[PDB]
Ligand binder design. Structure first.
Ligand SMILES: Cn1c(Cn2ccc(C(F)(F)F)c(Oc3cc(Cl)cc(C#N)c3)c2=O)n[nH]c1=O
Lengths: 536, 407
DNA sequence: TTCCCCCCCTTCGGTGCTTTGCACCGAAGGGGGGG
């Protein structure tokens, strides 16, 4: 019965909502009378003109419209910072899942705020004497009251482990099941002392247990069956559902790719047009279904051992990790396909995936795993020593299984003897949006090509392109644009722009390349000539 | 002591980053004892404000200290820190000989906090695997890290220091956050005993209180030019580019005779002999670079920006400036202890050294421009941090291709 | 006349330079998980 109230107010500068009164009157009150029998709903006089849009559903159901009150209620901090994950659950000998019913209907709301959650059925005006369903502050207040109730019991019993998630308790113990039933009985009695009507035998469970897409067996765990829709005419909505289901199922199924399935979503107009699939997307979906065809399982945590988060590369910006504590007995499986930045190579994506796995594992288990990256230590040293950022990877070993990540081409550090030198430049007019890109070598050979709808950066990159076309194996390109040199220095593998892609395709073939920057419009050797050519 | 926000700003609403199990279960065992003796009291959902919190280990003392990220609450209540009362920076501390750093944070654990303001200083201890909702807390006594606390305790600290200051006026006393800089001209052997005497005197005031930094060694480094007899075309091009880039910072820089020296489309490698006119021009340029930059002055109204570059081989460079292309200070940091351990480490002690230098010299922490990706910094900057302050930083993404400070 | 928490991709706007294009980041829209 007694639960201490929590202060609740409104955002300053306005009163409660007041929507027009609505003109069921006796049949629906019978349901509400039962609430008035216990004390869920009270009697409000005409001195409280606040009103909310009433609404009644037929349950297969007062779905009250709170949106104005929901908007004007003061800010409540969202203390639920995540969702418990099965892979972080320690193997408990005895388990019991309690589903607290009448959760929001047994927490008293503060007397000052009661008048705002009004209800109009004309007389008698209703007000929610308890925590309303769908209100903004209901989850936080209920969760904090549950924590305040459950803290003394957890202090009394240290070996009992209780996971709370909104309106549900999950209790585990190393005790024998005969004593575990007893301990659950004292837990239920203590909970019922405070007015919470915890079920005694109706909803208590025995293995397997069920949670959000989570079947929990005595010594394993798995997702609930993910049925991927099968159809011949896929619209965008079905593609979105497919992508979501595959992303959810990737938590335990290894080897999932959804990049080509999502690429079809690009360019669509509305949520109804039918987008035909390609061969890439169809093959990827067939592979996903045929790897999802067999059942796979996870394992629970074990603090006595060390996590080991392997990483593999599935080709063209897709990575997969299998966090485990025992070989071939996974704890968790994931995937990293996010590509940030328009110009990156494989090592940058690998270290991004490493940081992602580190933060996920700190969230879930509490300690960073021992990575086994598919990268040679010498390659990582070469990358991180000669690069302008501060890249780190916590602790790792090497995995000798291809495909293997490595740097592709190495720009030379010093000018190379006996090889040709090219002076490239491009210029594009601001208004006409037309330009020209050209180069002058040391032998006096000059070549220029007009270009259309290419700006200064574009035409500078095309000048680099011509220099790489017309040169030999070794070459020294000299530029005056900072952007071009910056793009080519970071040693990218692939880029969203195709011009950078072909530049990289040529840099792969060349044996030795050196790029040097010189200031523009200041008369440095061949810059005058290559600017006179583009100044025509 | 009433405390108020700056009107028209919402309170701190920053989310808590995930923490290691060791850090979480040390934070819990610190916060329990803090709550037992009234320092912090639990709070409910109705408090909509939150600031991060995380555990560090100072000087590897095997014990754990608790930092609360107050970088936003300070930005809100800068009025209580710069308008109400802020201690002016002693101008003589720039030229001092040796300074020691002490912590008087525990001395701040006695002054009660403003009754209305407490609800803003709320933090949250997370839980592993989201087992239970994060245990929330709020502060009841003055907090260690908020710039309002030095403003409140300035009078009390001054009354504490008046006997020792009067007895020994030679030492210069400065206070930033809850840290104290004591600056002595005495010998190194006696300076330590004098600092121990100061600590004992602080103890004798009923307030408990728990390194020989030498400010005078900090001088603006001069940018240097290459020097060799056989100047290749590529090296002459690099020199001309460097002179162009330095023409902004030094108005007297002139590069014209070398421009006439490079006329033909010559190869970058073949040696081009350098005449006597260019030798005279190089000598004059080095003479100009011998003098320091002219025109840089410190304006307390504007903010300090500190840029960091990585030169590889465990070398970093920093430039503290207010108006762009006019560096208020330049430097270089190098340590082989980080490289054997990590690389974000090197950056972390680099930031600590820069911020300590700027507090001692100017009197306020710079806004950093780190050369690091945000995720790999926010993940790992708590494992090596050891200073009870946290300067504001922004991350750079465009590569600083210039890197002409060390060519 | 359902409220939120969390993840993933895609598109839009702000933002700072690289300076008027280009490359970042975050916030919004779909999906997924239900509680
Ligand atoms: C099955 N199982 C286990 C695994 N296990 C271990 C500890 C707990 C604890 F009581 F701590 F919550 C469990 O209760 C939960 C927790 C969560 Cl997030 C979801 C669900 C569901 N549906 C049940 C639990 O399922 N150990 N031994 C055994 O048979």
């Amino acid at each position: 019965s007694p639960i201490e109230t929590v202060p609740v107010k409104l955002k300053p500068g306005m009163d409660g909502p007041k929507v027009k009164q609505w003109p069921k009157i006796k049949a629906l009150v019978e349901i509400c009378t039962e609430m008035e029998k216990e004390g869920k709903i009270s009697k409000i006089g005409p001195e409280n003109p606040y009103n909310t849009p009433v609404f009644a559903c037929k349950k297969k159901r007062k779905l009250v419209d709170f949106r104005e009150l929901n908007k004007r209620t003061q800010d409540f901090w969202e203390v639920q910072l995540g969702i418990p994950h099965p892979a972080g659950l320690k193997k408990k000998k005895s388990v019991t899942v309690l589903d607290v019913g009448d959760a929001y209907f047994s927490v008293p709301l503060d007397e000052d705020f009661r008048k705002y959650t009004a209800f109009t059925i004309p007389g008698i005006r209703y007000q929610y004497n308890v925590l309303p369903q769908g209100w903004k502050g209901s989850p936080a207040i209920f969760q904090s009251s549950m924590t305040k109730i459950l803290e003394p019991f957890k202090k009394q019993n240290p070996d009992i482990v209780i996971y709370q998630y909104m309106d549900d308790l999950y209790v585990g113990s190393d005790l024998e099941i005969g004593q575990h039933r007893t301990k659950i009985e004292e837990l239920r009695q203590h909970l019922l002392r405070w007015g919470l009507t915890t079920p005694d035998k109706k909803h208590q469970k025995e293995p397997p247990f069920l949670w959000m897409g989570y079947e929990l067996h005595p010594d394993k765990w798995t997702v609930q069956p993910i049925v991927l829709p099968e159809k011949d005419s896929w619209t965008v909505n079905d593609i979105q559902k497919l992508v979501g289901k595959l992303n959810w199922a990737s938590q335990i199924y290894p080897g999932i790719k959804v990049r080509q399935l999502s690429k079809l979503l690009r360019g669509t107009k509305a949520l109804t047009e039918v987008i035909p699939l390609t061969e890439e997307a169809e093959l990827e979906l067939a592979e996903n279904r045929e790897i999802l065809k067999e059942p796979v399982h996870g394992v629970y945590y074990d603090p006595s051992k060390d996590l080991i988060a392997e990483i593999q590369k599935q080709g063209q910006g897709q990575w997969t990790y299998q966090i485990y504590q025992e070989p071939f007995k996974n704890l968790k499986t994931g995937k990293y396909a996010r590509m940030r930045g328009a110009h990156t190579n494989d090592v940058k994506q690998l270290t991004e995936a490493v940081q992602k796995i580190t933060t996920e594992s700190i969230v879930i288990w509490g300690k960073t795993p021992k990575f086994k990256l598919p990268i040679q230590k010498e390659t990582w040293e070469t990358w991180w020593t000669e690069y302008w950022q501060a890249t780190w990877i916590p602790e790792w070993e090497f995995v000798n299984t291809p495909p293997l990540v490595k740097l592709w081409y190495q720009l030379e550090k010093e000018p190379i003897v006996g090889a040709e030198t090219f002076y490239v430049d491009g210029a594009a007019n601001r208004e006409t949006k037309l330009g020209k890109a050209g180069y002058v070598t040391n032998k006096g050979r000059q070549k220029v090509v007009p270009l259309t709808n290419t700006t200064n950066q574009k035409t500078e990159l095309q000048a680099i392109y011509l220099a790489l076309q017309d040169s030999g194996l070794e070459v020294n390109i000299v530029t005056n644009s900072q952007y071009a040199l910056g793009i080519i220095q970071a040693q990218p593998d692939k880029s969203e722009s195709e011009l950078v892609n072909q530049i990289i395709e040529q840099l792969i073939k060349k044996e030795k390349v050196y790029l040097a920057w010189v200031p523009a419009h200041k008369g440095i050797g061949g810059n005058e000539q290559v600017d006179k050519l583009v100044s025509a | 002591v009433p405390v108020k926000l700056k009107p028209g700003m919402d309170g701190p609403k920053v989310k808590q980053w995930p923490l290691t199990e060791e850090k979480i279960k040390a934070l819990v065992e610190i916060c329990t004892e803090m709550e037992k003796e009234g320092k912090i009291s639990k709070i409910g959902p109705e408090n909509p404000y939150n600031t991060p919190v995380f555990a560090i280990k100072k000087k590897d003392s095997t014990k754990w200290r608790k930092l609360v990220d107050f970088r936003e609450l300070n930005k809100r209540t800068q009025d209580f820190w710069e308008v109400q009362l802020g201690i002016p920076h002693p101008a003589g501390l720039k030229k001092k000989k040796s300074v020691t750093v002490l912590d008087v944070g525990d001395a701040y654990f006695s002054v009660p906090l403003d009754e209305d303001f407490r609800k803003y200083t709320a933090f949250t201890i997370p839980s592993i695997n989201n087992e239970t909702p994060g245990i929330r807390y709020q502060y009841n006594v003055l907090p260690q890290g908020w710039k309002g606390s030095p403003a409140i305790f300035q009078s009390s600290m001054t009354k504490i220091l008046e006997p020792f200051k009067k007895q020994n006026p030679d030492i210069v006393i400065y206070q930033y956050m809850d840290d104290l800089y004591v600056g002595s001209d005495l010998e190194i052997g006696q300076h330590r005993t004098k600092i121990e005497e100061l600590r004992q005197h602080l103890l004798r005031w009923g307030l408990t209180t728990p390194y020989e930094l030498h400010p005078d060694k900090w001088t603006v480094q001069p940018i240097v030019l290459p020097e060799k007899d056989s100047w290749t075309v590529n090296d002459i091009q690099k020199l001309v580019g460097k002179l162009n880039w330095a023409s902004q910072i030094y108005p007297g820089i002139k590069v014209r005779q070398l421009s006439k020296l490079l006329r033909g489309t010559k190869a970058l490698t073949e040696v081009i002999p350098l005449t006597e006119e260019a030798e005279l021009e190089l000598a004059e340029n080095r003479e100009i670079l011998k003098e320091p930059v002219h025109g840089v002055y410190y304006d307390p109204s504007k903010d300090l920006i500190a840029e960091i570059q990585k030169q590889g081989q465990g070398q970093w460079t920093y430039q503290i400036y207010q108006e762009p292309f006019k560096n208020l200070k330049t430097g270089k940091y190098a340590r082989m202890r980080g490289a054997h351990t990590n690389d974000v480490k090197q950056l972390t002690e680099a930031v600590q050294k820069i911020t300590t230098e700027s507090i001692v010299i100017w009197g306020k922490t710079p806004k950093f421009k780190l050369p690091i990706q945000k995720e790999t910094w926010e993940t790992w900057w708590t494992e090596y941090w050891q200073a009870t302050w946290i300067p504001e930083w922004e991350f750079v993404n465009t590569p600083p291709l210039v890197k002409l400070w060390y060519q």
